[PDB]
Design a binder for these strands. Structure first.
Length: 231
RNA sequence: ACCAGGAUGGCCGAGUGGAAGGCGUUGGACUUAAGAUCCAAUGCGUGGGUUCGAACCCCACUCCUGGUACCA
């Protein structure tokens, strides 16, 4: 089986080459994504191009081998071909992203081509602003009803239950304003990149729970809502 | 002649079943002007077959390339 052994040895050497080439492709990818200057970006892109072309030649060889009937268990060849194609797709994505011109036809409508962290930050800020709007609407409603009940008490000169409800509304407005001011602090910190999005999402559910129902008697107010974060 | 691989923009040339890149060409900017530089636009060798659809997988044809043609 000298011919079979020769083919096997060539296969093993080619697979080792593919492994090393994928390692180098990843290294060049990280270099490119760490680049700070356009020249660095272009040079790393060219190195990635050269490495992926080498990988493409190795993959042509792998496809020719797996086409052959000499090999019987070619699972390793299949896996290496899959890996090479994954690297090729990654490089194609990288090159299409970089080559695109800002004001060319394709570039005109790139839509939200912002870092996913930036998109999530914008979403969290928008949700905080909407919550602030809802809290302000609730505060306005509560203050209007407080004025109405004060007028009613003045006209009637009684209805102690109305005085109790007015004090309850006063406390509710106090808590709504506290929530609004804490939201404003959180958003201001987020804008300056001083707070994490995960930190905001850890209290998102509790803030939703409060806004959903806060004046009802069966209100389980968790005082430890803003206590986890030293705001 | 036998075996193997190729043929895709104008030149190189990637591509795998749901026309890229470099160079080049053209329009504008920069400069007195050119060059460099900047912002942009255009650009499957052949037939058949499977497939819902093949640049891609199979059959066949043309052009090229690589290796072999030994003992008397």
């Amino acid at each position: 089986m000298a011919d079979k052994r020769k083919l096997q040895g060539e296969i093993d050497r080619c697979l080792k080459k593919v492994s090393e080439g994928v390692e180098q492709f990843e290294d060049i990818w990280q270099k490119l994504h760490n680049a700070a200057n356009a020249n660095q970006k272009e040079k790393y892109e060219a190195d990635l191009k050269k490495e992926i072309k080498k990988l493409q030649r190795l993959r042509d060889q792998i496809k020719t081998w797996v086409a052959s009937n000499e090999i019987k268990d070619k699972r390793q060849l299949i896996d290496n071909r899959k890996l090479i194609e994954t690297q090729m797709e990654r490089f194609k994505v990288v090159e299409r992203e970089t080559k695109t011109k800002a004001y060319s036809k394709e570039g005109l409508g790139l839509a939200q081509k912002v870092d996913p962290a930036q998109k999530e930050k914008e979403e969290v800020g928008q949700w905080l602003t909407n919550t602030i709007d809802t809290l302000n609407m609730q505060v306005d409603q509560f203050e209007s009803e407080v004025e109405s009940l004060s007028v009613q008490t003045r006209k009637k000169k009684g209805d102690k239950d109305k005085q109790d409800r007015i004090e309850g509304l006063k406390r509710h407005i106090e808590k709504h304003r506290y929530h609004v001011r804490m939201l404003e602090t959180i958003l201001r910190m987020l804008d300056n990149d001083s707070i994490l999005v995960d930190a905001i999402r850890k209290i998102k559910d509790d803030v939703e729970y409060y806004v959903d129902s806060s004046q009802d008697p069966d209100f389980e107010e968790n005082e430890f809502l803003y206590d986890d974060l030293d705001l």
